Amino acid sequence: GLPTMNTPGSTQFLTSDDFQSPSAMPQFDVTPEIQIPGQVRNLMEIAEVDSVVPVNNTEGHVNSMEAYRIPVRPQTSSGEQVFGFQLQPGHDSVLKHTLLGEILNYYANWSGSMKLTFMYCGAAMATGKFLIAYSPPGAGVPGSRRDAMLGTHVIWDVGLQSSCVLCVPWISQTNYRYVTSDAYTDAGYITCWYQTSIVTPPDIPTTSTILCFVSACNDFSVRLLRDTPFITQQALFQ
Amino acid sequence: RAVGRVADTVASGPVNTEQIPALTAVETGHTSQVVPSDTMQTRHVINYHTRSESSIENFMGRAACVYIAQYATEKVNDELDRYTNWEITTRQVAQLRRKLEMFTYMRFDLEITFVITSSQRTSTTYASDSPPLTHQVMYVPPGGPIPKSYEDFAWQTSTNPSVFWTEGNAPPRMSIPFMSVGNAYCNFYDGWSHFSQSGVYGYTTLNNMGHLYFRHVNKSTAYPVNSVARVYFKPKHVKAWVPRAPRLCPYLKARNVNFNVQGVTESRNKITLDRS
Amino acid sequence: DRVRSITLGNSTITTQECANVVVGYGVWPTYLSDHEATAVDQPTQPDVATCRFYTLESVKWESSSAGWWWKFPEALSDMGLFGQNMQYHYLGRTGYTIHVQCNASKFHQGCLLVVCVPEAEMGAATTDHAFNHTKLSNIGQAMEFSAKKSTDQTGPQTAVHNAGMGVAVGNLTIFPHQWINLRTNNSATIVMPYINSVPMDNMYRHYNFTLMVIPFAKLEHSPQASTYVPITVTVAPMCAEYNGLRLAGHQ
Amino acid sequence: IQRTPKIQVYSRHPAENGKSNFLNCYVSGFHPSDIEVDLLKNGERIEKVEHSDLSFSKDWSFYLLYYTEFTPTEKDEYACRVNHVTLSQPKIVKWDRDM
Amino acid sequence: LSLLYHLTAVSSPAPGTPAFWVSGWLGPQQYLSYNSLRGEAEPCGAWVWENQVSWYWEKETTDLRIKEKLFLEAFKALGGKGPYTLQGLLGCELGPDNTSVPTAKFALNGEEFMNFDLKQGTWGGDWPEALAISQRWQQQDKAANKELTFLLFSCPHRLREHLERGRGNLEWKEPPSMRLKARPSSPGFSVLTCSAFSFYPPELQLRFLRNGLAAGTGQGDFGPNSDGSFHASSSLTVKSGDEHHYCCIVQHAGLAQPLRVEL
Amino acid sequence: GAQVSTQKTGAHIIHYTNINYYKDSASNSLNRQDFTQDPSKFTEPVKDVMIKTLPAL
């Protein structure tokens, strides 16, 4: 017949190939699809949805709802630190189990800008200002509010519009960063500081709550599929 | 511009306006669309990245193992009989289940590939000349007559699709179309089976894909071998709806969603960062 | 603007501190089209006898409350002609309009999360044991979560930080949701379309979606303020239609 | 879903006096979880009574044989006393020597 | 002749009692007992009167530890508050000469609700409690194949292992002791009894006659004994006169004539 | 059929030929080149449209 020649790579099973194969049940009449609402055509559509960040995960708070409640209270001296974490959105313990981190942990490269939304859940009569800052990774962690005002930051004033968005910009020497973070592609630090204080009229409780929210901006991107280091099994589930 | 490519960043300047892009209300259930060119001064950057690796086709389109079926050439126990079976489900491995549990209703064709390996069982001697083994994998639809044992009437596969494979060649592979009676595979089902709200609870009531029976075509060997047939599934032509939140606690069973409670995340010492 | 008035049937829900009206996945509830239906008989469509605002019982929000859940359509199984049409019919199809409401003050603080989870298949309290149906949902009783784990023999796992589904409770925002912040908001209104794999479904064997109300920031106030703040749920079916008429159910 | 038992009292051997005989008491047709059968000698509880293997008939109703090593004479009258979830009082059945 | 197993498991057992117990019946008399409180199966000293050296009785013990776990993993996917007594009938009967016919019935709360099919499915019933147990039982992934090779392959081979081993129990021909006695009653009538004691075969048809003509069977009762023997009874309210003519023409399987007994 | 289509390359001879051989649509290869998307169902599920630069309330 036709004179062929089997190239290297024949009779192999590469698990991520793209080939045709004979159907087992020929001329099967499938059921018609209908208009089910809420179709997903890309996993990045999921990663653009906010999910509340467990910033208060100091043990043992991961076994309650207190992992999400970031406490704020009236201070004596200003310029204190509210919270802070490194920006490792698939490896840091604060971010890697939010909705962004579970999508990122299926991949190995990530790129783009990120949003951080802070909804103040105190009383309607309390008033405060906060400084929410991002620091690129050159110099280390900012140890004071004076070191934090030199970075990318935004000064949030609470009021009727009860949430301010810090948009973490993409500053990197590489086009992508590794998800499981290493020393070469560090991404920096997110800190938040008391701009003035929390000032309240009498007969209001002291401690309040700020909820964080992480998502992805419209230029986010992932690459290089893998498995997650989250789910394990020893045997087949009977 | 092409489709799939992410958006650029327009050049911004200093502003002092009534407009407040940074302030919003989360209470309305609405994600803010604050691009970085709203809260700082940016340069025009022509972004060339695409989102090809993140679509539902490429996210699912890699073949994953779903079952490990074992069957010998000589009965030793009911478990290591001449034949074995498997109820077709994707809920027995932990890798593919967590991917398919990200969406509520999915609709896809399938591509089933078998990696079959035999190993000679431990005895007091092993010197035997054997011809190459031939395996049979018969797919039984819901309602079909099942084989009772070896040499059954029902291995004649008068209408059931079957495959025959001699060891040493390429692995077998056949494609399965969309098989459900509804309009999408229900990955979840918050409901009961009977109308009195009792019986079995959960997703097992709908997904009846059928069985899958394995055996050796060869009648016997001189010394018994133990074959193992790993089954690989690859979803192709995938549509998905209603994205669920990804599972956190590891699984316990194949018919349930039961779990032990776990932390929301890992712990750390304090809420602040304390270096210079 | 902040005010919004909703009129359905012979009832009318008004509010003066509203956030907005989140609507499902952008899809308004409609009737079933001719190129999608399967059952061949003429469906019944009572437009105002069943598409109106039914008000469930009120729950008490405390500073130690973990959360509540209702399961639909089973939560409206006796509210009027929506209950009677569920019994005399084999199939049903509807969308909803869930309006949760909770006013406190300008001196209270707290935050609720109102989610409609489609097919919130719940795990079991103790494993290796299936549970009763009356511990999943009674007819109108607000089934509630718990702070710690639950060791019930015949119930669901009601640890609120795992939300009954073995999932992180912070990630419940991809389902259609709103927040009731006592600082700003007062009510939360969600419109949910019919979400199922089959175009119509039986309304007794299958809970279509679960409404959850989870307090994230806990309720705090002075001891001299109003100690009792209630939460009230007001559900209204939308574009309901039924098929397969037979005797009264539901066995 | 509830059954009431049936007591049938009889002897193994014919009641020939002097030698020890066996009073086989038959309880049948009952569905509790637990039943209490007791053998009696004119109001005296016999201490040592042997139990048979508790089983069920073809219609999913249990049956159980209790028996003692009794000496039949004219004055030795016997009875069976059974306890159920259905019957409040324990049912008296008097043993007749003619069967 | 047929081998049969009588499985029963209760949810909340009475203390001091087993929660699961087996009674094996080679036809009409019992040969096998098992429970949970001792954890092994023993004979009654009735059928074999031998001790098999770890080749026959050691596999019956290991077989019923499997059946104990299947009968205790049942409540466990019953979500009711009430107690449950799960019953089970297992075994096979012999065909014409070969090809034994099996049987497998189960009963929850004294009512038959499921029965392991033969083709598909392995277990099934229209009751809501039947699908819950059937989905629970096949979760262990091999118990359904355990009973498929049980009813068609092992216990009929065990039956042909028993078809020629113990034939002295298949010839138990004990002719009974029959003692016509009588009691008095209400004025005008009398109460008659004819009874039979300690007989092995299960067939006996005892009736009452006036002179030479049949007058009725009476109320026939039945009960076995502590030694593989049975018992019958028959009573009738008869006339206070003519007691010297009521005859009891009754055959037996250990007898070749329907012997007459006297008052 | 000869559905010649473009290849997946980088940015700053590139065609490929594909022939279907079987009589079922479920025997084909994957549809790896469909990157159409809209996240507005999940990020903006709101009735009244919310302008970005305006107050939300």
Author numbering:
A (entry chain C): 1 to 238
B (entry chain A): 9 to 284
C (entry chain B): 11 to 261
D (entry chain F): 1 to 99
E (entry chain E): 5 to 267
F (entry chain D): 2 to 13, 24 to 68
What do the paper's sentences say?
The genus Enterovirus within the Picornaviridae, a family of non-enveloped viruses with a positive single-stranded RNA genome, is comprised of more than 100 serotypes. Human enteroviruses (EV) are presently classified into four groups, Enterovirus A-D (EV-A, B, C, and D), among which EV-B, the largest group, consists of over 60 serotypes, including all 6 serotypes of coxsackievirus B (CVB1-6), coxsackievirus A9 (CVA9), over 30 serotypes of echoviruses and more than 20 newly identified enteroviruses. The capsid proteins (VP1, VP2, and VP3) adopt the classical eight-stranded anti-parallel β-barrel configuration with the N-termini residing inside and the C-termini exposed on the surface. Most of the uncoating receptors bind to the “canyon” sites of the viral particle, dislodging the “pocket factor” in VP1 and subsequently triggering conformational changes of the intact particle to release the genome, albeit that SCARB2 binds EV71 outside the canyon.
We also determined the atomic structures of E30 in complex with its receptor FcRn and CD55. We determined the cryo-EM structures of E30 F-particle in complex with FcRn and CD55 under neutral conditions at 3.3 Å and 3.6 Å, respectively and obtained atomic models for these two complexes. Bindings of FcRn and CD55 have minimal impact on the capsid structure with RMSDs of 0.3 Å and 0.4 Å, respectively between mature and complexed viruses. However, in FcRn-bound viruses, the pocket factor was released and the pocket partially collapsed with the side chains of Tyr147, Asn215, and Met217 repositioning to decrease the pocket volume, similar to the pocket observed in E-particle, whilst there is no notable reduction in the amount of the pocket factor in CD55-bound viruses, indicative of that FcRn is capable of triggering viral pocket factor dislodgement, but CD55 might only facilitate viral attachment at neutral pH. It’s worthy to note viral RNA is still inside the capsid in FcRn-bound virus, suggesting extra factors/signals are required to trigger RNA release. FcRn inserts into the canyon depression of E30 through the α2 and α3 helices. The FcRn-binding site on E30 comprises residues from the VP1 BC, VP1 EF, VP1 GH, and VP2 EF loops, which form the north and south rims of the canyon and bear antigenic residues [see coordinated submission by Wang et al.43]. The VP1 BC loop is longer in E30 than in most EV-Bs (for example, 4 residues longer than in CVB3), and residues Asp86 and Glu87 in this loop, together with residue Asp138 from VP2 EF loop establish charge interactions with residues Lys80, Arg140, and Lys150 from FcRn. Overall, hydrophilic interactions dominate the tight associations (with an interaction area of ~1150 Å2) between E30 and FcRn, where 14 viral and 14 FcRn residues are involved in forming 16 hydrogen bonds.
